[PDB]
Paper text:
The type VI secretion system (T6SS) is a bacterial nanomachine for the transport of effector molecules into prokaryotic and eukaryotic cells. It involves the assembly of a tubular structure composed of [name] and [name] that is similar to the tail sheath of bacteriophages. The AAA+ [name] [name] disassembles the contracted sheath, which resets the systems for reassembly of an extended sheath that is ready to fire again.
Here, we solved the [name] structure from crystals diffracting to 1.2 Å. In the E1-B1 complex structures, there is clear electron density for residues 8–20 of the extraneously added B1 peptide and for residues 8–30 of the co-purified B1 fragment, respectively. Both structures are nearly identical to the structure of [name] alone, with an r.m.s. deviation of 0.4 Å in either case, and to each other with an r.m.s. deviation of 0.3 Å. [name] homologs also show conservation of residues that line the hydrophobic pocket with residues 171 and 181 always tryptophan and proline, respectively, and residue 154 always a large hydrophobic residue (e.g. Phe, Leu, or Trp).
Numbering used by the authors: 26 to 287
């Protein structure tokens, strides 16, 4: 009876309950496009990818102006399956921008991990990170000597979706990255960004905003990007986190990242 019931449950972090309440609202008002937009986004937060894609089609059918969003987010959902294949060591991603050969051992480490060779994988990651070039920069006004993801499977690499294609972007290939705080619920899953490549062009992009294992292995707070937690694997779930020589910065606290020209 309370039109805000699903939102109330959502803000409390009660995802299963929020979904049940929202589904009941949609059943009552099946032509309400606003409810469908909420539902696709909630399903994406919950990692119910096929159902999210079905609801996104309904959004575009009810609200034709939403078709560009439908296309962009449908493909973003497809890319989550590719992320899983990459982190499982079964496929390898496009490298965006100038080649970065040091990423090859970084990817082969994922295959070694999948095969149960954790020691060998760690050795390859050390080789990768040793070969990755040094580029200082700034987060906002604060300088850094180096920057890396807290996820040691990436290190100084940014997962991106550009023009509906997933890629690994070596941070050393960037001039700048600009983001705003998340606004829409879908921003918790894929954060919009403007990327400028060093010696190159600029593009809008989506940044996968949570670690790939979050859907399956995190709790509701992690799925909402409200925390970053380390599992028995020694890897994080939840909101993406960056580390520099000076300290840590959560993705949703980032606004601008600049690298010094080399």
């Amino acid at each position: 009876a309370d039109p805000m019931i699903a939102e109330e449950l959502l803000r409390a972090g009660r995802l299963d309950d929020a979904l049940k309440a929202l589904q009941e609202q949609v059943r009552s008002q099946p032509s309400n496009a606003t409810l469908r937009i909420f539902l696709f986004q909630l399903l994406a937060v919950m990692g119910q990818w096929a159902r999210a894609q079905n609801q996104l089609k309904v959004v575009g059918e009810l609200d034709a102006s939403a078709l560009p969003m439908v296309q962009t987010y449908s493909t973003a959902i497809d890319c989550e399956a590719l992320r899983r294949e990459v982190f499982a060591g079964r496929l390898t991603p496009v490298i965006l921008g100038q080649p970065a050969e040091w990423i090859a051992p970084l990817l082969q480490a994922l295959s070694l991990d999948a095969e149960g060779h954790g020691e060998a994988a760690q050795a390859l990651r050390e080789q990768a990170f040793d070969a990755a070039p040094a580029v200082p920069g700034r987060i906002g006004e604060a300088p850094f000597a180096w920057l890396a993801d807290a996820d040691t499977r990436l290190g100084p690499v940014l997962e991106v979706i550009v023009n509906g294609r997933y890629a690994w972007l070596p941070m050393s290939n960037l001039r700048s990255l600009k983001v705003e705080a998340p606004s829409d619920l879908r921003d918790l899953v894929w954060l919009p960004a403007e990327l400028t490549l060093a010696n190159g062009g600029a593009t809008v992009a989506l940044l996968p905003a949570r670690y790939a294992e979050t859907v399956e292995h995190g709790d509701d707070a992690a799925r909402l990007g409200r925390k970053t937690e380390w599992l028995d694997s020694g890897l994080p779930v939840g909101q993406r986190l960056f580390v520099t020589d000076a300290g840590e910065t959560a993705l949703f606290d980032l606004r601008e990242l600049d690298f010094e020209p080399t």
